[PDB]
Design a protein around this ligand. Sequence first.
Ligand SMILES: Cc1cn([C@H]2C[C@H](OP(=O)(O)O)[C@@H](COP(=O)(O)O)O2)c(=O)[nH]c1=O
Ligand SMILES: [Ca+2]
Length: 129
Amino acid sequence: LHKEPATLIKAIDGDTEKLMYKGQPMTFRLLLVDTPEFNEKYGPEASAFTKKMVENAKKIEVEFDKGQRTDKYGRGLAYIYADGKMVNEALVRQGLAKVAYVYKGNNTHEQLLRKAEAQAKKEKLNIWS
Ligand SMILES: Cc1cn([C@H]2C[C@H](OP(=O)(O)O)[C@@H](COP(=O)(O)O)O2)c(=O)[nH]c1=O
Ligand SMILES: [Ca+2]
């Protein structure tokens, strides 16, 4: 897989964000994770965590996996990086997301994110508390 440029347009919530990719605005849904909705427990925290991470970054990158690049809603499906740190992993490591929606053929970072979930779960963080 390879990283590609993008710039923040607007944070949306824990696992969706509006980015400019190849010069076009797109809503991106983070692969392999599920954050609570804003109205749910930990949803406000998930939203703030992603928003801070992507807004503070000097450099946003998108990384598509090997399979479908957009979902049935027109959202791009990617790993998003903020100054080289993967937002998908960082949410899971903090117990602000669950590993979820693992579909074969877009699951390259599955095991990395499960390792992070296991550690958030150990530490009883947030969703695991
Ligand atoms: C993360 C992801 C979600 N989706 C679809 C599955 C779900 O369909 P349904 O809308 O029918 O429940 C929905 C979950 O996204 P959200 O967690 O953002 O709602 O997005 C994919 O198709 N591919 C993906 O990789
Ligand atoms: Ca969600």
